């Protein structure tokens, strides 16, 4: 079989960790969290990620899949250690990279074997040559003479859909600069790949951009998008037909064109955030790049201003209510959510605003406090409001009863930041 | 069906012919009578593989007819296309004046109902202030003639015409009644993927589709002119972001830039739509600017690597026109690097299949026109390939290397693994 | 939308589940009370992924609401879907009387749509049925009926049904087609890829396209067993050929034969309705006779490598459903080599994830159970991987080594490359 | 790169063309001196100009001795043709082997794009190396396989714009070789046995799709379902896909047929019969009844001496190659039967003289050929026949009856019979 660490209990660490378990390898998961690490150990956690909870559960159970807190314990136990650590923004816009390096140490200082250290974290072009001397520096510390190798494998897997993604990419990019792990590497992933061998193996530098490239990619698709949608607004054009009329080019495909009220996420930003910072430290100035980030950040506003607008500017103190507050359908996750965007600015104004989401309320409740009204369900949010935003576009909003609606709320108003709505009510949306 | 098609650029001409060719009577007008009597001979007014056999084919049948008088067509046609040229006007805005012209000549000669259905790719509302031309001139007439306007934006990329118009990914038609609606269906339906819409979103699609592509192509120059810098291979980060479905692998290589009477006009016109309508197309402008710089790279590796030393050397050029495939030189990267060649007191030999006779007209005597590829070469310090022709693909090293002054080759298209080599990326 | 679904088999609730995600208002009705119950309380395993979890917040959130009286849901509701069972002749007598009923309690108009897969025609006779009861009532009432088939897979059955690559729907009136795009466009926020058909049309699709699929594997087995033949390698083929666009990559894996129940039952549905006809479907009856050899071939491959000699060898299988993610076992090819086993006298130790509680209901006593794949193999002269789920992928291959008898593993999926042992593999 | 391609067929021709195209010194091989003669002064869109474009440029030279570009090549393609005991006739591919053998100076890599049998690498080693041996000479060489997978009228565009192409090798320097030769123009690099089978399963892969199509398309007509809506039913799963799912009156053309026959006999050498393609080519060869007995059927068994129009000839549109053409099965049913056939095909019209004669009337064009028709039978799609005068139809004709072999035609007078 093989043995495997992998380092981290973000979505990526423990999408992959587990899945690896469930394709017949036994792996250890590590985490500097203490309290989560027991948590995921006896199923006391609430996991929102779709199929991930179970997973976790039948394989441990069937005792393939163990969770820790020490990195040293789990290093000489491995044939190959993922780093899947987190790598957030850094003061000044640089991807931060001290939890990566530190699990470099930590591996370092416990290796007694060869092993293949590959770094699944999201980490700037060059980082391969830091995470090599810092792992060689601990094993020169103890005057040991120990081989290994070291490769990039970034993750591409969405929050929401991550174990499909996981199981079934449409490609896995591998970075390396031996035989020895393009070998070990291959005999990984083989046996999941069973449609095709789909395995891209690339020089480490070309990799770790690789995934830079493609973030900035995807969130370039929704900047153009957002700014075709606004302009189609002013001209009146339509922007689904649009974005149909674009999507069915070959070259272009139909994919992430959705214009919406912006995208969130600590991904796309951050990532896009890093790739700009790591031009500029190269004197390079990256103009598409700084566009994307300037027009999502003007995005994430115009659902009040939308609202503001209907009102001519007399929005002071009005009920809302709000579906949606996680940044996309099918987690939690409220970083960088446009949410939070709307929920500041109604929060300026003296608005009282009623929130629904099915699963990140509590998330909402650690961010927010007492400030925002925590709602029941769709239709309790809408009690009294004077306007519903329609925020994220989870399944149980696509299809509401517009006559209980209209009952319900003060003002029979929706406006729909992701374009999902038909009326049989005003209804204003984006584009 | 009886069609006309008013236009004889590839648009015009490929579309009239395919019509043709699928059954059609088809009439086909301009007003260059010098264009139209080559075609009345048998030759064509531009170079487009596969189609001067097709027309002859379809004239000979009687399908296809040339002609240059709009009023003469109007009265035959169930149908008639407006597909003239719409170029970048002086201030960057689409000329309109072939298309509105075109509008009145069929408002002057209507006899009873007409569709018009303008390919021509116009700006966000055009269908408008065209149906507005046709009805004054029926007006002034005091004729009580009713008529559909529609809108059917061409994607069709010059030098593979026919292809992209006889296998099209999609159809996109902008209608706003069911007679349009019918009858135009009745002229897909025996080729055929169509997508209805409203008329402004089908004219709105055409600008977006070619603003996306360019965004495509400045988002990877941008990756690769990054790449070189911190010692990444963009032609692996290529094949690693475009084997995301949600991404796609076409449509993702950068270069020396993109050209053409396309791309660099579609742009610009939406981005001033946009200012017509107090909005910042942020995204577009920044995509624009990347583009102006990339086409000064290839005289910059040059110039670098002579430290800046490059007077009264010798240089060569392989690819004058905008892209493989073409005589059409508009916005072409090989200019702005001549262009400055020439600033510098270079010496400049030029080499393209089918382009020099264009290249002539524009540059006159300030290049050497070669015979072919290994005759540009000779003496040269730097040969530049600037446009990705099949024929450059396999060059002879040797052959080169002997006949070259210096054995360098700066190549804007990332075509080559071996001399010095310097790409983009 | 108010929806009733009748049937509770994957497809009537995956469908209804998934109509209540979406925040219809959806009442799923069968006869099975003890199983509505459970479904109700949420207290019945379910193996497919996603299911249990989805009906449990739906039912909680009053989207989602179980029944065993058809007559109750019918005047709430403005489409009715037939999911029921149509079990080579069809028995259409779930289908006619859950029509019979859905007559009896009309109370205004209705859109009628069959999801079952039921044979061409089929919509003039459910017509039929309901127009009686609204006869025998005295009641003049409007409705239409619709053909909806499914396209969903076990294992995958809602990520299918969320995301289908198309909806099918056969119609014969603008009232119903209206209808039917009101529920399905806001699900489908892509791209709103409904085919609209008439109704005979959409009935025989269903078949059709089961019967290609059967086709696809069919014709690569046989690709597969001449592979063996001449020297090539039928994955790299599959590659070769699958990489045409007019082909492409998907269904094209040959192995042990496909089984489940649908298949089976659609290929032999379209040979009869052809025999019904005086036609003969030549390529669907080879494409049957294909597959049932090649239910056969694990134990060919066994017996020709023990020379004949396997009377009291002990083995071990690996996967009993007819495929990874259920725990039905169908038509699986697990039954054929057990019970050509079980002929010839060999011990047979056995193991799946999720399906061995209906393989005892099947067995009995003839195999032994165990508790997990290294259990399995304890002191076996063969191994067959016979249902590729993810767990066997990557196994400890030295501990394989040292609890069986004899390190020889027959592998029916094309999963395994060696590191021992001997793997014997299709093509 | 020089290399050399042997045969002038569209395969050979297409392929050495390209490779002039894309820059290599290409010499194109065959043993017909006048065809060499021509080339040097078959239907396929843009190959005359492109031809001509590499001769002037002195990178397509044409000849007829093998002999004289074997020891100036550094790859040598195997391109002649495989034609139909219904086993492939080896005939040309081995006697192109022995050539190389006999002129081999230097070593070479021998490429069979060939359609050819699984194992036939091993039989063009043997070939190569007898005669070697009987030169008593010591050369190394490589063979690998790079099957093609051109249509016919569409091929320079196949050949440019590969889905993917299939390489069997058995060696690095092969390998190095042929991604040298095409990395400046996706290649699947697999044994050679496994090309050579890739080649047969394809070509049989699509026969099976029509001949599944046909099947259901018949069952279609008896059962009161429209089989163009089922093909859209089916073809929109991503797992069958759209393309090559259409029914009509058969599959003809020299490939499949022969391809089909040759995969199903190598099967019985080796003691296995694949009952799949055994079935999907008796369907085929039913399916080329089709339209004759619908036309009997309609006029009651009573067709002597009535005039009947078809609307082409060739075996699929674009090309004048009428091998295998469902149009000769109609045809002679008609002609046995007594019925007085007039055709028209817009380049297939000298081909079919030469196998039909003076038994059918050649017409000018499409309504000339309907002229007193008593039926209309459209057999090939070509572009021209999509949009007909219906008027002008009926006015011309003795009976307004069209029956459509490639479902094409919705009726806007007629009677319209066609398949499923
Ligand atoms: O680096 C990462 O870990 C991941 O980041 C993203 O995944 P994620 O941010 O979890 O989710 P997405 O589905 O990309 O959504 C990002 C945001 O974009 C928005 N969005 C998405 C698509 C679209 O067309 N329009 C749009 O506004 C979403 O609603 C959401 O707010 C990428 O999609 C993953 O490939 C990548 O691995
Ligand atoms: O390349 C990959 O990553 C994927 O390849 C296949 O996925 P796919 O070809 O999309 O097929 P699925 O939709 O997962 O399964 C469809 C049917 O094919 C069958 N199948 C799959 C794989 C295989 O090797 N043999 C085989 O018969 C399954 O039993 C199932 O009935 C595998 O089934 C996945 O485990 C893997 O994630
Ligand atoms: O509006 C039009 O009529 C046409 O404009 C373009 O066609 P075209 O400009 O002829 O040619 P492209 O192949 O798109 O090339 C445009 C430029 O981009 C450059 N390019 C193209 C692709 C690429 O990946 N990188 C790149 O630098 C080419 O060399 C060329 O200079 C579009 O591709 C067509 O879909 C469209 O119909
Ligand atoms: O009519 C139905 O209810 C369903 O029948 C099948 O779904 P299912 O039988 O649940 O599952 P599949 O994944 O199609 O597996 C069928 C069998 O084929 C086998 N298989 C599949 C793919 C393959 O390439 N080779 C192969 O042997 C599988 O292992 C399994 O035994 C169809 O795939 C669904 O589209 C259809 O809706
Ligand atoms: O047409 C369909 O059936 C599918 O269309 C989309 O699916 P898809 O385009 O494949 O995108 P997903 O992978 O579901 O989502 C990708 C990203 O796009 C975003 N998205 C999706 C849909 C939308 O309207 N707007 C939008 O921003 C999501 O928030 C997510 O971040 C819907 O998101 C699916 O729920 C639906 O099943
Ligand atoms: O071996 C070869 O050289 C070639 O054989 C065929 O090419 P070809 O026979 O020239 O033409 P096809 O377009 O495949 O048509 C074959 C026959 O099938 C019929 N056909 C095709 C497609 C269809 O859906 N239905 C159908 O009846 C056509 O009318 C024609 O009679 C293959 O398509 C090529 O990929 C292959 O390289």
Redesign the interface.
């Given at each position: 079989?093989?043995d495997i660490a992998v380092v981290g209990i973000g979505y990526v660490g423990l999408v992959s960790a587990t899945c690896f378990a469930?394709?017949?390898?036994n792996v250890r998961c590590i985490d500097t969290d203490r309290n989560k690490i027991e948590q995921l150990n006896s199923g006391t956690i609430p996991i929102y990620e779709?199929?991930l909870e179970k997973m976790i559960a039948r394989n441990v159970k069937?005792g393939?899949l163990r969770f820790g807190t020490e990195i040293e314990q789990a290093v000489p136990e491995a044939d190959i250690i993922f780093i899947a650590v987190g790598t957030p923004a850094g003061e000044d816009g640089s991807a931060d990279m001290s939890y990566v390096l530190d699990a470099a140490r930590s591996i370092g200082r416990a290796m007694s074997r060869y092993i293949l250290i590959v770094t699944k974290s999201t980490v700037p072009?060059?980082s391969y040559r830091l995470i090599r001397k810092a792992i060689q520096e601990e094993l020169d510390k103890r005057e040991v003479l120990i081989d290994f190798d070291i490769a990039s494998n970034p993750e591409?897997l969405k929050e929401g859909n991550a174990i499909?993604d996981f199981?079934k990419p449409?490609?896995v990019?591998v970075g390396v600069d031996s035989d020895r792990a393009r070998e070990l590497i291959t005999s990984l992933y083989?046996?999941?790949l069973?449609?095709?061998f789909?395995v891209?193996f690339?020089?480490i530098?070309?990799?770790?951009?690789?995934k830079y490239?493609?973030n900035?990619?995807?969130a370039?698709?929704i900047?153009?998008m957002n700014?075709?949608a606004?302009?189609?607004e002013?001209?009146?054009?339509?922007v689904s037909?649009?974005r149909?009329?674009?999507?069915?080019?070959?070259?272009?495909?139909?994919?992430?064109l959705?214009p919406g009220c912006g995208y969130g996420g600590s991904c796309f930003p951050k990532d896009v955030k890093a790739?700009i910072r790591?031009?500029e430290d190269?004197?390079?100035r990256?103009?598409?790049?700084?566009?994307?980030e300037?027009?999502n950040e003007k995005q994430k506003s115009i659902l009040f201003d939308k609202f503001s607008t209907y009102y001519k500017g007399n929005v002071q103190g009005r009920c809302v209510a709000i579906w949606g507050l996680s940044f996309k359908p099918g987690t939690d996750d409220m970083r960088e959510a446009p949410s939070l965007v709307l929920i500041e600015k109604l929060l300026e104004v003296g608005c009282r605003v009623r929130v629904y989401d099915?699963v990140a309320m509590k998330e909402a409740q650690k961010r927010l406090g007492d400030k925002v009204e925590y709602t029941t369900?769709m239709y309790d949010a809408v009690r009294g409001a004077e306007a519903l935003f329609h925020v994220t576009?989870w399944?149980?909003?696509?299809?509401?009863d517009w006559s209980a609606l209209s009952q319900a709320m003060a003002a029979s108003l929706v406006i729909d930041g992701r374009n999902?709505?038909?009326l049989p009510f005003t209804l204003l949306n984006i584009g």
């Amino acid at each position: 079989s093989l043995d495997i660490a992998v380092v981290g209990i973000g979505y990526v660490g423990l999408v992959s960790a587990t899945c690896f378990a469930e394709l017949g390898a036994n792996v250890r998961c590590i985490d500097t969290d203490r309290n989560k690490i027991e948590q995921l150990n006896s199923g006391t956690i609430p996991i929102y990620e779709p199929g991930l909870e179970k997973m976790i559960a039948r394989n441990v159970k069937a005792g393939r899949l163990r969770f820790g807190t020490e990195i040293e314990q789990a290093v000489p136990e491995a044939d190959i250690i993922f780093i899947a650590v987190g790598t957030p923004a850094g003061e000044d816009g640089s991807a931060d990279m001290s939890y990566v390096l530190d699990a470099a140490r930590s591996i370092g200082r416990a290796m007694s074997r060869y092993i293949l250290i590959v770094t699944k974290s999201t980490v700037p072009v060059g980082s391969y040559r830091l995470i090599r001397k810092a792992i060689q520096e601990e094993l020169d510390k103890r005057e040991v003479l120990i081989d290994f190798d070291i490769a990039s494998n970034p993750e591409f897997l969405k929050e929401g859909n991550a174990i499909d993604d996981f199981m079934k990419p449409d490609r896995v990019v591998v970075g390396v600069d031996s035989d020895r792990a393009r070998e070990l590497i291959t005999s990984l992933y083989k046996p999941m790949l069973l449609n095709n061998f789909r395995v891209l193996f690339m020089d480490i530098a070309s990799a770790e951009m690789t995934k830079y490239a493609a973030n900035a990619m995807l969130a370039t698709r929704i900047s153009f998008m957002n700014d075709v949608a606004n302009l189609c607004e002013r001209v009146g054009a339509d922007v689904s037909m649009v974005r149909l009329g674009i999507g069915s080019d070959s070259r272009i495909g139909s994919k992430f064109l959705y214009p919406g009220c912006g995208y969130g996420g600590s991904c796309f930003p951050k990532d896009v955030k890093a790739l700009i910072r790591t031009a500029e430290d190269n004197g390079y100035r990256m103009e598409v790049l700084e566009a994307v980030e300037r027009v999502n950040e003007k995005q994430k506003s115009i659902l009040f201003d939308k609202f503001s607008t209907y009102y001519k500017g007399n929005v002071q103190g009005r009920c809302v209510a709000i579906w949606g507050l996680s940044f996309k359908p099918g987690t939690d996750d409220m970083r960088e959510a446009p949410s939070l965007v709307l929920i500041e600015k109604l929060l300026e104004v003296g608005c009282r605003v009623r929130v629904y989401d099915p699963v990140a309320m509590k998330e909402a409740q650690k961010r927010l406090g007492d400030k925002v009204e925590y709602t029941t369900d769709m239709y309790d949010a809408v009690r009294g409001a004077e306007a519903l935003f329609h925020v994220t576009e989870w399944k149980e909003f696509r299809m509401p009863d517009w006559s209980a609606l209209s009952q319900a709320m003060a003002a029979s108003l929706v406006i729909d930041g992701r374009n999902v709505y038909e009326l049989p009510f005003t209804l204003l949306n984006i584009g």
